[PDB]
């Protein structure tokens, strides 16, 4: 069973590897227009030079990179807002914005890793071939591999170090997700984040179909091979091949509604009270990335916080709900 369409309830943005300096951008009206340089430079080359690159290599004063093309005379993504600004762009395969599947698979794992450490137990998972674990992790912790030990005792355990997390033991390789359909030019828009940076994102009111599918044939082969604390918690119920999906969408619901209740602890407060609740990247805070909601913790985080909390246009920065 597939075609698990998503709706957006908030501005949502995927960071990408690019940013847009104001040489590419000039809003002639309130609609911010994104032009391409290759059609602007080469068509001006028939009308004439190193003076075009000298203003480009300067990056000074922008306003002067606009009037030359306005008088004596393009199209692109045309992402409207609805200077000295740096728009963090969204991911586009051909100028068409889509949601990457590797981003949606990661938001599920932080919920599933929370439920596995909540049901615990762990001494039976390390009872074999080791050569409720949060309370020992504070003494264990006393560009980083801090989840290299916690996820190895929860997802995939292989035998220098006692546990080193070979990927072959992982029950997450049966869950396949695929990249969603492209959203469209009209549902991509530029917004301003006010931290209690200009970014283009997806406004609420869009619908694209991400196609989540579960491979049952791998768990039948790997019934003996998996060494996860996830696996013990998911085989103990019984019917692990048919119980994995059941465990999947209940970790999606019980984690992010527990984060939503802690977040409530005016106009944004009405958004919290008013499908499957899921929270994606760049918008979720460290707590919604982290088992720090379960987390001793202040002594660990002082050496390794609820200070900053971003928001754009009266709304939090990610809430996407599936079926």
């Amino acid at each position: 069973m597939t075609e698990r369409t998503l709706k957006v309830l908030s501005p949502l943005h995927i960071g990408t590897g690019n940013e847009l300096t104001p040489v590419d951008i000039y809003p002639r009206e309130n609609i911010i227009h994104v032009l391409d340089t290759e059609r602007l430079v080469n068509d001006l080359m028939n009308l004439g030079e190193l003076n075009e690159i000298l203003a480009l290599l300067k990056n000074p004063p922008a306003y002067i990179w606009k009037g030359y093309i306005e008088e004596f005379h393009p199209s692109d993504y045309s992402i409207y807002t609805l200077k000295s600004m740096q728009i963090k762009e969204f991911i586009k395969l051909n100028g068409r914005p889509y949601i990457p599947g590797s981003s949606l698979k990661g938001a599920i794992r932080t919920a599933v890793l929370y439920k596995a450490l909540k049901e615990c137990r762990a001494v039976m998972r390390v009872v074999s071939k080791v050569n409720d674990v949060l309370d020992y992790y504070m003494s264990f912790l006393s560009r980083k591999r801090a989840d290299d030990l916690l996820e190895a005792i929860v997802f995939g355990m292989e035998p220098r170090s006692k546990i080193r997390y070979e990927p072959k033991r992982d029950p997450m390789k049966a869950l396949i997700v695929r990249d969603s359909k492209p959203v469209g030019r009209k549902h991509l828009a530029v917004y301003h984040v006010e931290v209690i940076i200009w970014v283009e994102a997806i406004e609420p009111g869009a619908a694209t179909d991400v196609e989540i599918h579960v491979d049952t044939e791998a768990l039948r082969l790997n019934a003996d091979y998996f060494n996860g604390l996830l696996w013990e918690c998911l085989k103990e119920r019984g019917e692990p091949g048919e119980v994995f999906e059941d465990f999947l969408w209940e970790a999606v619901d019980e984690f992010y509604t527990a984060v939503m209740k802690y977040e409530t602890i005016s106009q944004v407060r009405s958004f919290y009270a008013s499908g499957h609740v899921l929270r994606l990247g760049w918008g979720s805070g460290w707590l919604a990335m982290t088992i720090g909601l379960l987390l001793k913790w202040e002594n660990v985080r002082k050496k390794l916080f609820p200070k900053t909390r971003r928001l754009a246009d009266g709304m939090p920065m990610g809430w996407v709900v599936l079926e």
Binding site: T21, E38, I53, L56, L57
Partner: protein, 136 residues
């Protein structure tokens, strides 16, 4: 020695700035010999490592040299020169030190016979990137 600079690389950018400014003083295409071309490339990448520039930030420019390299080899240059300028715009800082070596080479290349001078330009630009990773 090529291996001796790695012992010293691991204010030090100023001592190699005379080596980069001397190489930027000579801008004629094929003005150095085959052994002298690679000896310039050791001084470039050692200068580009003290004020270090990552290969990614350069990676769009390295793409346009390579897609043309299949099109030159039995298959234009201003498209690379337009990208080599615009990538140097969004610095921050050491992108100007990499622009002072491309743009003298690309201004001469801008009008040049295509089959020979670009294939000789492509050997120097490999050794800059190639030797840049050998030091870091």
């Amino acid at each position: 020695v090529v291996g001796i600079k790695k012992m010293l690389e691991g204010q030090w950018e100023a001592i190699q700035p005379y080596f980069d400014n001397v190489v930027r003083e000579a801008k004629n295409f094929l003005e150095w010999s085959p052994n002298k071309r690679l000896a310039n490339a050791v001084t470039v990448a050692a200068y580009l490592t003290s004020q270090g520039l990552k290969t990614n930030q350069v990676r769009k420019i390295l793409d346009m040299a390579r897609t043309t390299e299949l099109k030159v080899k039995r298959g234009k240059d201003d498209l690379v020169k337009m990208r080599y300028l615009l990538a140097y715009t969004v610095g921050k800082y050491s992108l100007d030190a990499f622009h002072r070596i491309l743009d003298p080479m690309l201004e001469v290349l801008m009008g040049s016979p295509k089959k020979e001078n670009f294939e000789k330009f492509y050997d120097f630009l490999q050794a800059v990137v190639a030797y840049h990773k050998f030091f870091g």
